[model samples]
Target: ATFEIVNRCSYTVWAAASKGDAALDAGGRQLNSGESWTINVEPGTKGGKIWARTDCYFDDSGSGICKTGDCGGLLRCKRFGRPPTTLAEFSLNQYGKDYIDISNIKGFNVPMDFSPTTRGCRGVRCAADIVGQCPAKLKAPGGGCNDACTVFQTSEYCCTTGKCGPTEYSRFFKRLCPDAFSYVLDKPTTVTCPGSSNYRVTFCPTA
Candidate 1:
């Protein structure tokens, strides 16, 4: 059967979801979102386990109530790193269809990915401009990107407008440090120190 999970961290999240559990026979293990694996779930089968977290860090080494894992420090489930505060669950009669729909949920027996077109579900789209990695627009003063940006991926050089703007300088900042500053060259060191330059893009350095 197909299993999916969505992360609701009240924030972006320190890590992705995972699968794992104490019962070794259940074949429970850490799993991450944007990925999936198949398990033998006979039609109407009623026996399984669930763990919460991004991988195997839930409740410290996946030893929480579920013994699976959680999203970095946030609580998730064992079957897949999904939060209880936002959830929905179901069993596959025979592993059918393109994807499943999970919306307005508060907890799930198994975690599932959040796809908006799945009907009723609210799939959050993470982009660079939204997170301050790039300018909201490409040619003008402001606009949202036609694509999402991530710390690991490259952003659109020429925005949808087919021209450059002030954002060009900002791109350098993102290239140097994806999650470090906003669009400026410097900012307070929340988790890591800048390789060389130390300026204030997020917050002024102390001392």
Candidate 2:
């Protein structure tokens, strides 16, 4: 399947994908406002994720820092980075199902839409003004919200020990984006599409 990621945020966004998550080795790259990138993924790929980094400055050597979603100052990220990033997770063609979702569990940096662009499947999105309305304690250093789990790193929020549920913090995210996975064990957020379908991720989407 193919994935197209677009930036409509009126700012630069560096899109990053986990290493070996797709058929392509296309490392993370920068996207000016209105630009887009496409990734061709092979079948049976699981645990694929895509995200956008904001407020960045990279040198020719692809080394720089981003206010949010910084992956060790590397411009071409091969692993998942720091939090305050809205996530688009995908697991394509596993057991006749495609698990897809937009999760705010890591926090939200941008409004995003993760949806099937083909096969008439459903879509999920988290486009609310989460950053602006972010709780004071959950606010990141720059621009974005930090998930309670990320901020506190406790079992109560992370469910790390296997006993957890939503808190006031997660509820804030849920209230803003009903379809997003606000915390671990979240439901109605993961959408299963038809086995064969391509998807798209739009940042700061208009529709």
Candidate 3:
């Protein structure tokens, strides 16, 4: 009936899930180790994406900043979070299956595992520690890995020219998270499975 968000890491992770103009499951929460939250999405909750924000600091006014994936400095984000974060995209109950994928094309701040809980449904995940092993050119000043498009801003790297290919930078991410969307042309990253009553999105599943 809902998507289960789990935190398996040592530190806290601020989780955010959104679709269209509406936020789901209160939009945001601080998930400590072993903590879990659920979002009961109604039918037709299409084009939803869930992601985590790291190294956040906020006051009672709900105004603050995050080291990675900040959503315009608001605690309850009405918009999509900023880049340098992992993304779990979903379109539930579509044509009798769920389309799910963990994308790192925006760059990765944390590792994630996405799996369906329904019977006979397959799972897909990218649990590599990308932050710890991020390349120097793509490393964020605070913490996390940056996308080549964000750092380089070139037509070739950003794919603004409508024709692009992998570079050393994109290859680095592909090698680490082979199952994630590492570049503009990354294929084989999507996973389709039987729509389950519930799905699990785990942060730091390997850690």
Q: Give the number of the best model, judged by lDDT.
A: 2
Q: Runs in model 3 with CA error above 4 Å?
A: none
lDDT per residue (tens digit) for residues 1-207 in model 2: 888989988988998876332223465889999998987766777887889999888999989998898878878776776899899988888898888999999999989999899875789988999999999999998879999999998989999977788899999999999999889977657888988688889999964
lDDT of 2 at 146: 96
Q: Which candidate leads in TM-score? A: 2
| Predicted candidate 1 versus true structure: per-residue lDDT over 1-207, tens digit per residue | 323322333212222222233221233334332223233333332222222322233455444433122323334322343332112222222233222222111121122233322232232211122223333432112111111122112333223343323244444433433432222122322221111111111000111
Whole-model lDDT values for every prediction: 0.27, 0.86, 0.82
TM-score of 3: 0.92
Worst ten in a row by lDDT for model 2: 18-27
2 or 3: which has the higher TM-score?
2
Q: Summarize candidate 3's per-residue lDDT along 1-207 as a digit string, tens digits.
A: 488999998888888888848787677878988899887766556778788899999889878988988888877766778889898888877887778888887889888998877766666787887878888989999788999998888998888877998889888888898888888877767777766447889999886
Whole-model alpha-carbon lDDT for candidate 1: 0.27
Better of 1 and 2 by lDDT: 2
Clashes counted in candidate 2 amount to 0
lDDT of 1 at 7: 33
Error of 1 at 196 (Å): 57
